[PDB]
Every structure is written in C-alpha cells, then in structure tokens.
Amino acid sequence: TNLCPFDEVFNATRFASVYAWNRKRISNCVADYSVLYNLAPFFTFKCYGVSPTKLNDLCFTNVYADSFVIRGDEVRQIAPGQTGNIADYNYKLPDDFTGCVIAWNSNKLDSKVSGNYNYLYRLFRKSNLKPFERDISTEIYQAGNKPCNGVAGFNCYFPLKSYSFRPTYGVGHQPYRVVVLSFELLHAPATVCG
Amino acid sequence: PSTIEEQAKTFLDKFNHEAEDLFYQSSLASWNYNTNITEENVQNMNNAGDKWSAFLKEQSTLAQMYPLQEIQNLTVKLQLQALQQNGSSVLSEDKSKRLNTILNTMSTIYSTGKVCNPDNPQECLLLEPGLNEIMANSLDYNERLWAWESWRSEVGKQLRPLYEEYVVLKNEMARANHYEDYGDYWRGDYEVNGVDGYDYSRGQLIEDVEHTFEEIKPLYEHLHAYVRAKLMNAYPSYISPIGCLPAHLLGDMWGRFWTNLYSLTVPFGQKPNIDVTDAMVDQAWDAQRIFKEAEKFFVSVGLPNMTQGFWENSMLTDPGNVQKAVCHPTAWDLGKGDFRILMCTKVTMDDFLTAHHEMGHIQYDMAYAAQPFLLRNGANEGFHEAVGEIMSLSAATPKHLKSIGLLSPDFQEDNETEINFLLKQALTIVGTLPFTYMLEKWRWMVFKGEIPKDQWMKKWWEMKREIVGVVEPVPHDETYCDPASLFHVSNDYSFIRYYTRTLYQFQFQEALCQAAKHEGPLHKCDISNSTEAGQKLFNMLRLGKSEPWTLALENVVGAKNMNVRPLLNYFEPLFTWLKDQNKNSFVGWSTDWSPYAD
C-alpha cells in the first residue's frame, strides 16, 4: 500500500533525451491519479481509452512511465497515428494506445542563454520505429552509396542532432517535458490501484 | 539504391538543423550590438557572424556536389540552387580578395567622407547628418550647390577608380556563373524556370520595366511641370520654364525623392494638414500603445497577434542614455519562433505609421516560418517592402484615424486636402520612379558594356536630363563618379527593387481594398476589419519563396505580372488636377538648357 513514486519521475532534475527515452516501471503501490486535474498553467493532459476520474478506481498489473524532452511543436507527435522525426525515429506510440500523455513547458529549467545542448533527438534512420522501441546507437547514417566506416563526411551523417534550447525561443521551439503512462493487464495479478 | 534527389533531401535536412542554430547565434549577436553599442558586443557579433559565413561557404561547396540537372522535385531544386550560388567564390582567391577590399574601401569612403567649408579647414561635415541637413532644409541656392558639388567632387572622385575595378571583377564573377554580366546576374532575382504558365526570364524584366515606365511618363511629366512652375516662382533667376530641374534643388542629396519640396509646392497652402501627434500626446500614448494599436490592426483582418516573446524581447523605446543603440527601425526574424522589432519610438504620427509598416514585415516573417529555412523570404526582392508599405497606407487614412479616436469626427475632408495629400504622396512615390529606373538602366548598360569608361559621366547626365528631367548645375568630367555618391551604388546593392516594390504595393492595395468592399477613391481605403482582405494577403504571405513570384502575385491580385494601372488608379484624382493646373504651363523639358550654360 505504499505510494507510487511518480514524484521522482515528474519532479526529476534532468529528463532523458527523447532518442534515449527513460522508462520507469511501476509496481506494488497505490496511485492517486486525481492528483492531476490540477496545476493548470502549462500542464496539458490527453488520455486515450478511459477517463482519469474513472481509472482512480481501477487496478493494473504494471504501469510504465516514459519521460523525455522535445520541442513544443513536436508534442503533437506523442500520440497514436502520428508521423515526423519524433514519432518515426525517437518515440512511437502504437495505433491501439490505451494510456495518457502529460506534457508541460520547461523553458525555466531546460534552456540557457548559451544554449542547452544536453538534449538530443535522432534525425536519420533507415526505417521507422516499431512502437515502444528505443534506439541509442550512434552509427553513422549512410545517405550515399559509399560506406562511411564510422566517420562523418559527405553523405555520412552522425544521426543525432542537438536541440539548442535558449530561453528566448518561441513557444514552439521551447523545451517540453513529456511523461507517457502505459497500463497493461497480463495474466499476473494486479498491483497498481487507486 | 539511393538517388541523388533522395541524397539532396537528406543533405538539406541536416543543413536546415545546423543552419537554424548558427543563424540564431549570429542574429542574436547582431541584436545585442545594435541595442547596446559596446566594444565587447562588436567582437561577439563578428565572431558569431564569421562562424555563420564559414558554415555557409562550406555548405555551398558541399551542396554543389549534387547536380541540379538530376532533380525533379522543384521545391528541393529551389533550395539547392539558392545554397549553390557560391557567388564570389567562383573567382580565384586573388580576385575574391581584391574585390572584397574594393567593396570595403568604397563603403568606408562613403560613410566617412567629409567636406569642409572653404572658410574654416577644421569645421567639416559628413553626409549624415551634415550634408543631408543642408539638402533637405536649406532654401539657399549657393549653399545647396556647395553641398551637392563638393560631395561629388571630394568623395565621388575617390570612388571613380575603385568603381571601375568593381565593374570588371563583378562582371568576371557574373560571367563565370554563366550570366552575361553582373546586371543580368541581378535580374536573376526575378527568374522563374520549369513551372508552366508562370515562367519569367531575366531579359523579360527589362521589357516589363520599360513598358510600364512608358505608362508612368505622362503623370510624371505633369508632376514635373507643376513642381518646376512652383519652383520657378521661388527661384525666378535660376529656373527656366522649359528646362530640366537643377539637380541640387530637389530636397535631398540626389533628387531620389521629392518629399521635401512639399512646402514650396503644396497646392492649397492654408488647408490644415493631418497630424495626429498632438492627439497622441494629449491622450498619453507611449511606445507600448502604438504597437498595441498596430497589433489590433492586423488582428482585425484575421492575422495573429504578436508572440509573447515579441513584447518581452523587442526594444521599442530608446534605452535611455547609458547604452547607445542603432535607431534605424528594423524588423528582426531570428528563427526559432523569435521575432522582434527594434525602434527608438517617439510619440508622433510618423512613428505610428512606421510601427505598422515594420509590424507588417513581422507578419510576413511569421507567416512563412513553416517553410524550410532557405525558402523563408519574400517571393522576390520587392515583395517584403510592398507588404510593409500597404500597412501604412491604410493606417494613415482619415477613416482609420477617426476610427481609433485620434482624429476628430468633425475633421472635414474635401477636394483640397485630398489634392494636398496626393501631391505629397506623389512627390515621394512618383518622383522616385524615373530616378530609380534611370539609375538602374545606367548600371545595366555599364555592366553590359554599352557605355565605355570615357563616357560614364557623359551618359549619366544625358540620361538624367532626358529621362529624369533633371540637369547637373556644374559640368562633370570623367574624374567624377556621381552614381557612386549614392549609398546603394557604392555599397553594391541592386536598385530596381524600389521600382517593382512601388508597382506591387498598389496592385496589393487595390486587390485588398476590393476584397474589403471599399467604396470610393482608392487612396481613402482602410482594410481594417476585413477578414477577407487579411486571408487573401495571408495566402501569399505563407508561401515565402516556395512558389514563383508570379504565382504569389496572382494569389493576391489575380494577375501574373507587374502592372502600372493600380498606381495610376491611386493617383488619378491628382493627375486630372495637375492636367488642369498645367494648362497655362509648358509640359516636358528641353535637355540643352543648364544652369552653367550662359
């Protein structure tokens, strides 16, 4: 009956880069999901499948918390049936998605005047991602028809590009922190409730 | 199996990401200097600027290794071509260096050139503010003559050898990029290829400029005849009733605009003029309120408000006196959703209109920020300015001013205040059209080779007299280089853009005012509150330069080419008034009279 450690996910000092997104597995705890519906400025929430008020009286076996940072312009891609650099190459939600996506603006925390180069996203990849797949490889992307042998050059691109977060960017280019909640029901007993 | 077009697309995706970051650092570094002039900020501006230029030259060279001939997607081709123009880097390194030295020497001579009064060797004037204050405000014939002549004889004579070497090297650069000369290279800005129904050739711009200039001639001759008659009354011993206007009596250093002749030419000299400055002061407006009103203007036609960053990061007032700033009003698009205006705003009517003009640019910039980096511009070199200009047309009308409460409803508009307004407009807008065409025709002919070196100044003044109806007050031999005494000529900027802008702006204004269902003469039109006008404009603004400029123009005005009829439509009430005023005067000019031929 311990409380579900969502605080260390949402209030964490540094998020993952979206190409190397972080997943926290939740188990054996009670979560009060009505803790949301609150903190209205810049917290946005969108659930797929069942109302937040209604799942606070519901039990699941595992919950997963995926967190990362992206541009505001790109939050719309953290949603089922979307395309783009983020949904294709960094973090992909399945068509039949039954969870929630929380996002908030973190310009105060993730940008600085000299430019925050901490956060990366993958820009090139041979194929799109299967849902909930992660790719942290740093192999040189072969655009041309010559091998790259692991050095960047003509038609040989390092595939990870840095966001550049500065506090004077427009809202669409500012950093947003994103938390993605998946709920699953396997044969094993349920241990996450409300 | 990977095609060249697929390779190009991927190359441009990398370029777009890198370019946007490096450009933001350069633009912001430029901002910090222009708002806070310090030795430290010069360095940072030059460091970030140099990193940006170095990236561009590297990416231009890398871009050339993809052949255009093998690209089908036109929006990819357009981006590749724009980055592929290496320009000066087609010359040998020795000639690049020579040319860049020449450009720098011409620029600093223009901006540091000084003349000293031939009474005190140590009391000297620069062009800005010294000589410009004489040329816009003095009524004294000899003082103006001294400024006009010594500017061209002290500074212009310095630019003559440099300018000769500039033509040779710019032509070599142009010919090595397969243009026929530097003038043809400049006209390249209007070229459209490969889009059926919307193509436009470089040689077609000369034709359309000349064909439209013929239709402007009668309005210009009558404007010229009326101005000459009024100045003949002020200067009876200096002006011939059949000759050209002397070139030092036109209200600035070149006769580029005739704005400042208004006080000697105003048709109805006791009708109150419209100046809402006193009302703004009475109502306690500040810079904030002005920009709020201009924002209200664009919102009323369905365009977006300004971003939150615009209000926080712009500089709308002079920053006091500790920090110094470059106060020329400019609209800034830094990328990454960051838009700002720099303006040392005073509470006056001129700065109210200027705010609307400058915010018009921002509106253009915001609308095409969704295009890829290299397509984020006006559809051609004249579009951006035209968008700015039509905003101030609406904002200044009595209808708009009464509507926002700066003008008393009891202000009476009649025949005569409209004639005064139209005349003042014409002095600026129509008076510059022969100046602009004539100047660019001269450069075009010099670059083509049609004017030998030993006839440069001879052909310049023959064309001044014959096309512009203006005559030099002092004979000039070939040690002079009078065109280079104008900023754009010695600072290597194309000039026909001011001609095409002027025609575009009345084409736009006529189209929008029709969409706004405006009743009556075109010059009284205010497009405020018309979401149909705002949408029609927006459909062109969002294109940037992803489409041929001919198409972009069709979107707003339903025609594919530059057209003079809207300009003539705007000035028709003045034209018929001038035609009746001139019934006792000679219309036109003889080229053989001059102030010094006695």
Ligand SMILES: *[C@@H]1O[C@H](CO)[C@@H](O[C@@H]2O[C@H](CO)[C@@H](O)[C@H](O)[C@H]2NC(C)=O)[C@H](O[C@@H]2O[C@@H](C)[C@@H](O)[C@@H](O)[C@@H]2O)[C@H]1NC(C)=O
């Ligand atoms: C020329 O290349 C463009 C970029 O490679 C194409 O735009 C892209 O088309 C994709 C179609 O599957 C679409 O998902 C992408 O979002 C889009 N990207 C951008 C930046 O627009 C373009 O294709 C045309 O434009 C888009 C908007 C769609 O309407 C397509 O159906 C169009 O054919 C390419 N143009 C041509 C003529 O091939």
Ligand SMILES: *[C@@H]1O[C@H](CO)[C@@H](O)[C@H](O)[C@H]1NC(C)=O
């Ligand atoms: C994060 O911290 C704030 C302030 O301490 C708190 O109100 C909020 O509930 C915390 N988040 C969670 C998920 O507990």
Ligand SMILES: *[C@@H]1O[C@H](CO)[C@@H](O)[C@H](O)[C@H]1NC(C)=O
């Ligand atoms: C102006 O620049 C100096 C150094 O370049 C800096 O210390 C100062 O804070 C700046 N002023 C403002 C208002 O930014």
Ligand SMILES: *[C@@H]1O[C@H](CO)[C@@H](O)[C@H](O)[C@H]1NC(C)=O
């Ligand atoms: C711009 O207009 C929209 C529509 O009313 C509004 O929601 C938004 O807050 C406005 N922006 C600002 C900075 O006022």
Ligand SMILES: *[C@@H]1O[C@H](CO)[C@@H](O)[C@H](O)[C@H]1NC(C)=O
């Ligand atoms: C625009 O609409 C508002 C609301 O009716 C009005 O107060 C304003 O005067 C209108 N402007 C014009 C030029 O009609």
Ligand SMILES: [Cl-]
């Ligand atoms: Cl001149």
Ligand SMILES: [Zn+2]
């Ligand atoms: Zn402008």
